Amino acid sequence: AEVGISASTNIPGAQYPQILSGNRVLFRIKAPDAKRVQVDLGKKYDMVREEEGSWAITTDPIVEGFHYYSILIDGVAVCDPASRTFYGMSRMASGIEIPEEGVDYYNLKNVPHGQIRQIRYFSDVTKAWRRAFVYTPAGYDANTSQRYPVLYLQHGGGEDETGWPNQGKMDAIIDNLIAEGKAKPMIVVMDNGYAVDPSASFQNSALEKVFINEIIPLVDKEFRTIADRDHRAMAGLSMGGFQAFQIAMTNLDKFAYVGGFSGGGIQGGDFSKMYNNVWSDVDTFNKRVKLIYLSIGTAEPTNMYQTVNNFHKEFEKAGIKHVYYESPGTSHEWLTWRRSLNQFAELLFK
Amino acid sequence: EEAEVGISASTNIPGAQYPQILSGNRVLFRIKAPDAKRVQVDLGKKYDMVREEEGSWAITTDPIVEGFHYYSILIDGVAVCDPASRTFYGMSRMASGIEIPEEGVDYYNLKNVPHGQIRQIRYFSDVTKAWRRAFVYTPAGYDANTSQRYPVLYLQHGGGEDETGWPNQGKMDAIIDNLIAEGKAKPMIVVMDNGYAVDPSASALEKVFINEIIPLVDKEFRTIADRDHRAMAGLSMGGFQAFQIAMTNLDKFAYVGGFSGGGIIGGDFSKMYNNVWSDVDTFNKRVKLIYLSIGTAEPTNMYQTVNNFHKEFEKAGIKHVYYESPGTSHEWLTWRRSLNQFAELLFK
Ligand SMILES: [Cl-]
């Protein structure tokens, strides 16, 4: 087709890319001297030369949600000049948003809004400056005798602490849930899933030390938190989900809620003994933990699906109580993770 | 002749070796692009890289001036972000940037001092009927000192940039944190918004500031909401906007700053901004501070505009501070220096 709507991820003033009927995407770029121009969106497409040095292609229908993508000039993968950038795939990378019909819980609404703030701290573990983003709920500044539970929320491999604020649209998701009475007012802390102890010789003891010895005490000191395990949760996507289980299950005195979004799991050991025998007494474990949540997209790559799905099945066989969610029609991509946060946050602190 | 090694720039993404800053502040770029026909880097000027053995291209630049520089990689003439570097919103797109340090200069670096916070606030504008976003710096101790109220600086970016400019390119939180911690600047709130506003039914930006941003900040934050505790400043375009908005709303502002911008004009300088300073002597008692800055190395047209604005102020007897930033051009180090100076003068 030809008439379309500019993607919401376009830089201001950029009319292309445009989403056509059927969620095909029309890409254009001016590159008169280029030898090859491709777009990598689900798969690689060669653009075709058009008039006055421009190239264009119309993709197959693109599945609804958020997708990283690249323009390739002569095989060199780069950010599209026409789109915003995100930290993903271990660099700055383009992303494109394909709207869902009749879904708007991750969109901005005229409801009371929280705030995402940037906090900087020097880590003694890593001997480096670090940065976290902290969501506070609407009315935080005025309700000075109110305190709040805290969710610690982590990004995936190749991403960083800007992931949930940007790709994850987390402030809209949480703003809307709280405004509709579906989630309790809560603080959300988004840090970086990488940590290097320079003196040291998906498990990372440095990251665990950073969380337990630095981030949690800092957040509990700078914010009006309810600083106990019944009001503290940890969750993450992919790598961050493995980290959430590793850190929470070896520090159950600090957390009663844990979530893995397309992450978590593992001959594979003696499942009975995972995380230093944390659930070797299943009955006691089930009453220590208020929530274990696992999610996966139905369309994820087979080995990713199997890892989380087999984790789910081991919980069933052992009788470990948990919530299990398959996101219909999505893969190892951010819409799976927005859906997961939406469900998980509704379950927290109840 | 032989190859060299250097220090990876602080703007590199984690693990990325290049660019490296060599001795003399020459910069070494090296990129894998085996199937490309031409690879260039645009940093001050364009350089052609030389294809090496395994499809790697490399070039060493001339000495690069200290400070922050936008740059691009060009593959077959297509200007893109360098995959090796972080990105910034500038030149009306996402673009690479590179930082070249100044030895012994660190007022814009992170120090072990009490730190403020930059927070994101959203609001829906009646003028533009679109969701907008501002970044608001609150000084160290803001949450704990609930009885304290604060003066406010409205701080604007340049043409082709956006509200992320001062937090990122500007390193503004380090600059203000450090001034406050050293007792050189009073504790203050800094508001950074977007310098573009379009009325869909069609100044729109002036109404956004006067009717939306300032009332929103005064309601959401513990501000001292009067002109003696409200300032406005900006760089390039943002400096022109600061003068236009503040000079037509002097009831709202007592301090105004233009960093490489501000000099609207062969006419009657005495009549500018609807005769705001026609009576020079009452103007000088109404305004606490006029600040103008420029880099000595800025393009001639840009230097003359600000310098001539300053000289018109001098002829008319209008009190103001004028600073020429030595050796810097129309680039962010000039504006980091300006904010450092300007914030010291505010609310005193
Ligand atoms: Cl991962």
Author numbering:
A (entry chain A): 294 to 494, 506 to 570, 573 to 656
B (entry chain B): 292 to 493, 509 to 571, 574 to 656
Could you share sentences copied from the article?
Interestingly, DmCE1B in the D. mossii PUL 17 comprises two individual CE1 catalytic domains separated by a small CBM48 domain. To assess the role of each catalytic domain of the multicatalytic DmCE1B, the separate domains were also produced: DmCE1B_nt (45.3 kDa), comprising the N-terminal CE1 domain and the CBM48 domain, and DmCE1B_ct (43.3 kDa) comprising the CBM48 domain and the C-terminal CE1 domain. DmCE1B_ct forms two discrete globular domains, a ten-stranded β-sandwich domain consistent with the CBM48 family structure (residues 294–393) connected via a short linker (residues 394–404) to a three-layer αβα-sandwich (residues 405–656) typical of CE1 enzymes. Comparison to other CE1 family members enables annotation of the catalytic triad in DmCE1B_ct (Ser542, His638, Glu606), which is found in a groove between the CE1 and CBM48 domains.
Two protein molecules were present in the asymmetric unit and aligned along a noncrystallographic symmetry operator with the two α/β-hydrolase domains packed with β1 of their β-sheets adjacent and antiparallel to each other and the CBM48 domains clasping each other. The two protomers showed high structural similarity to each other, with an all-atom root mean square deviation of 1.01 Å. Two stretches of residues in the α/β-hydrolase domain (residues 493–508 and 572–574) were unable to be modeled in both protomers likely owing to flexibility in these regions. A chloride ion was observed in the active site of the protein coordinating with the hydroxyl of the catalytic serine and the main chain amides of Gly450 and Met543, which likely comprise the oxyanion hole. No inhibition of DmCE1B_ct-mediated hydrolysis of 4-MU-Ac was observed in chloride concentrations up to 100 mM, indicating that the presence of the ion is likely an artifact of crystallization.
